[PDB]
Amino acid sequence: APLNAARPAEERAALLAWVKERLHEEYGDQDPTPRRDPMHELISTILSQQTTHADEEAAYQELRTLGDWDAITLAPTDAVAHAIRRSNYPESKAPRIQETLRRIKAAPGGYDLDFLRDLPVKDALKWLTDLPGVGVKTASLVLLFNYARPVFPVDTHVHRVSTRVGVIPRMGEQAAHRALLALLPPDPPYLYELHINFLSHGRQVCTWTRPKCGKCILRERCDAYALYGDKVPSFSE
Ligand code: SF4
Ligand SMILES: [Mg+2]
Ligand SMILES: [Mg+2]
């Protein structure tokens, strides 16, 4: 009857703090994220759309056979599209890559994003999300992991576990970025631990279909388990 998702923000923030502590007990400092440098992360994200991880990595490395970022920026777009042919829609991704590189080069510094470290957090997010093919999750991940800014990336795993438990009601993934950050401290190491532990939990236990609730440390405070028991449905749209 009294679901977490309907509780006041202060109670949902305390719930999320409990979740963070329990997941850290389960996973510690285990980190399943790729931990890429910022240029690699941005370009990989552009290539990742509707593409498997193996094909994304292969397309990225084939792209790097064209040379450094300056050479990729200047290469004929068809050469870039051919190089990234393992990813879906290479003809559309090639101009996104070249435009993103052009904009990064024009920013202060070389092919780096260190200038983002000093910008106000919202301005830095907007600068990255303005890049073609780059969304708020990747912008948040780059700022958090590479630059220690207090933002919280929400991927499919974070969104699914948080929503099932009831830390937030059901909403879109972009909205969940604001909603979850509003429940969290401006503490980048804390935000990063929570992000990676959510990823571990979503991959190992709270899976997209048939989650393993009987193996889940969150079970006694999970809205989804309280509503469905051992029949929590797939996390759909
Ligand atoms: S109890 Fe089940 S649905 Fe709830 S967080 Fe754990 S695995 Fe996910
Ligand atoms: Mg530059
Ligand atoms: Mg964008």
Residue numbers in the entry: 19 to 255
From the study:
Endonuclease III (EndoIII) is a ubiquitous bifunctional DNA glycosylase belonging to the helix-hairpin-helix (HhH)-GDP superfamily of DNA glycosylases. It is active for a broad range of oxidized pyrimidine lesions, removing numerous forms of modified thymine and cytosine bases from DNA, such as thymine glycol (Tg), a major stable oxidative modification of thymine, via the Base Excision Repair (BER) pathway. D. radiodurans possesses three genes encoding EndoIII-like enzymes (DrEndoIII1, DrEndoIII2 and DrEndoIII3), while other bacteria typically possess one.
Previous comparative structural analysis suggested that amino acid substitutions in two DNA interacting loops (DIL1 and DIL2) and in the FeS cluster loop (a structurally conserved DNA binding motif) could be the origin of the reduced activity of DrEndoIII1. In DrEndoIII1 we substituted Arg61 and Tyr100 in DIL1 and DIL2 with the equivalent residues found in DrEndoIII2 (Glu and Leu). Compared to previous analysis of wild-type DrEndoIII1, which results in full product formation using the same enzyme and substrate concentration, DrEndoIII1 R61Q processed approximately one-third (25 nM) of the substrate compared to the native enzyme. Our results demonstrate that the affinity of the DrEndoIII1 mutants for the substrates (with THF:G mispair and C:G pair) is reduced when compared with the wild-type enzyme. In the case of the R61Q mutant, this probably originates from the substitution of a positively charged residue with a neutral one. The crystal structures were determined and refined to resolutions of 1.38, 1.95 and 1.89 Å for DrEndoIII1 R61Q, DrEndoIII1 Y100L and DrEndoIII3 G250T/N251H, respectively. Additionally, the DrEndoIII1 R61Q and Y100L crystal structures include two magnesium ions, and the DrEndoIII3 G250T/N251H crystal structure has two chloride ions.
